[PDB]
Design a protein around this nucleic acid. Structure first.
Length: 60
DNA sequence: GCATCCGTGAGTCGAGGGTAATAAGCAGGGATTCGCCCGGGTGTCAACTCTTTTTTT
């Protein structure tokens, strides 16, 4: 929960690009939060040492 | 006891006729759906036997 709350503002930058496509802003933010919470479960010390590099794919 | 801020209203019949924009990718496994075909129940016909109303004797 702490890790998903620390990177909560990262999804707002990705959700801003997708707009006026049939979904409101809050719904897109909630979907991005779902994706981020689903991506935080699997994160090891792989080639990508930044959590954002692995979370952006799941959020998108 | 007053001053400031948030809802309702606006006639009625007629014409005029349709609209419009963003845009990842691929691997696994199931549920769905379209072609062919055997088939058994529904139709469409050759073709064998009682009854009888006269029409003939």
């Amino acid at each position: 929960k702490e890790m998903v709350e620390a990177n909560l503002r990262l999804v707002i930058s990705i959700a801003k690009k997708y707009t006026n496509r049939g979904l409101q802003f809050l719904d897109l933010i909630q979907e991005g939060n779902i994706g981020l919470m689903k991506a935080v479960d699997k994160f090891e010390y792989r080639r990508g040492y930044k959590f954002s590099t692995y979370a952006t794919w799941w959020i998108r």
